[PDB]
Design a binder for this molecule. Structure first.
Ligand SMILES: COc1cc2ncc(-c3ccccn3)n2cc1-c1cnn(C)c1
Ligand SMILES: [Cl-]
Ligand SMILES: [Cl-]
Ligand SMILES: [Cl-]
Length: 310
């Protein structure tokens, strides 16, 4: 039956073809105890989001960043059933995130509570929420004012975050604006929000046996062969660029997810230039949607092309 899995995954390449890799599993690796934080020092707030397996909650953490100082954090946890398989899925995400290291454009792990109670993973709080809702909130406030350089900066930062994950040998299997968070200074951060989401919350995911597939964000090789590489993420990134430069419009607007959608993608269908994009930004998008993954740009390339335009 269906299990919890972070959409952030470490991988190891075993050859030079796209399907020659496997997924790194931390279940047999040991958890580093220097990350352990006392549960007594967490004061819980609202539910940020709730899924089938668990939820993410706002909280106040005493002494996590500096001595004597309370800050706001976000806490992943399981729901009370506490099935032991789901427990280890969440330990594996913990161990994985402890090995990543931090980066400005990733929602970083701060600590965890694992010994005297139910498992908590503790993350940086991002006050303005997911990028998708943020962009949508600012449709009637675009020149609280949102400008074109802000949009370009968001694009640059997400690419920067993905460069980090590439260099650390990770992929994100669900890169989209709903999984990017916004915080002070127009700063954006890639996260894995999957534990806080359901099938009721989202029609952008298609049920298919065990899988829950974000079809309109997926590269052809992901859709047709089940392959997720960093070049798949470049496709997804293109789709996320379209989201940014339309202020959060659903991709392939008005087109439903069905067998005809699979055919569109197979035959080379690509979205049009959205309102807030320049022609140069649309040329970037279009090359992210190269059918052949070798023709797509890399995240170092995109970090340059968008370092320039700023
Ligand atoms: C205030 O909104 C947030 C703030 C926030 N800060 C951290 C996180 C988070 C989410 C997942 C994993 C790790 N961290 N987080 C999530 C949200 C959030 C809640 N709902 N939506 C749509 C975004
Ligand atoms: Cl996710
Ligand atoms: Cl959501
Ligand atoms: Cl989902």
């Amino acid at each position: 039956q269906f299990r919890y899995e972070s959409q952030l995954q470490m991988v190891q390449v075993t050859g030079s073809s796209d399907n020659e890799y496997f997924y790194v599993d931390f279940r047999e690796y040991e958890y580093d105890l220097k990350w352990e934080f006392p549960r007594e020092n967490l004061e819980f707030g609202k539910v940020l989001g709730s899924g089938a397996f668990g939820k993410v909650m706002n909280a106040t953490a005493y002494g996590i960043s500096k001595t004597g100082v309370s800050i706001q954090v976000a806490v992943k946890m399981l729901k009370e059933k506490a099935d032991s398989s789901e427990r280890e899925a969440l330990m594996s995400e913990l161990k994985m995130m402890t090995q990543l290291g931090s980066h400005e454009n990733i929602v970083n792990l701060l600590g965890a509570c694992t010994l005297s109670g139910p498992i908590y993973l503790i993350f940086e709080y991002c006050c303005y929420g997911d990028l998708l809702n943020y962009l949508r909130s600012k449709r009637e406030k675009f020149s609280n004012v949102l400008t074109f350089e802000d949009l370009l900066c968001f694009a640059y930062q997400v690419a920067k975050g993905m460069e980090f994950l590439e260099f650390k040998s990770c992929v994100h299997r669900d890169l989209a604006a709903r999984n990017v968070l916004v915080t002070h200074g127009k700063v954006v951060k890639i996260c894995d929000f999957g534990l806080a989401r359901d099938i009721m919350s989202d029609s952008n995911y298609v049920v298919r046996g065990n899988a829950r597939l974000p079809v309109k964000w997926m590269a052809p090789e992901s859709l047709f062969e089940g392959i997720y590489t960093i070049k798949s993420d470049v496709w997804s990134y293109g789709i996320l660029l379209w989201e940014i430069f339309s202020l959060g419009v659903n991709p392939y607007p008005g087109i439903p997810v069905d067998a005809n959608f699979y055919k569109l993608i197979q035959n080379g269908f690509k979205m049009d230039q959205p309102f807030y994009a320049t022609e140069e930004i649309y040329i970037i998008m279009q090359s992210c949607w190269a059918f052949d993954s070798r023709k797509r740009p890399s995240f170092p390339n995109l970090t340059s092309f968008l370092g320039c335009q700023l």
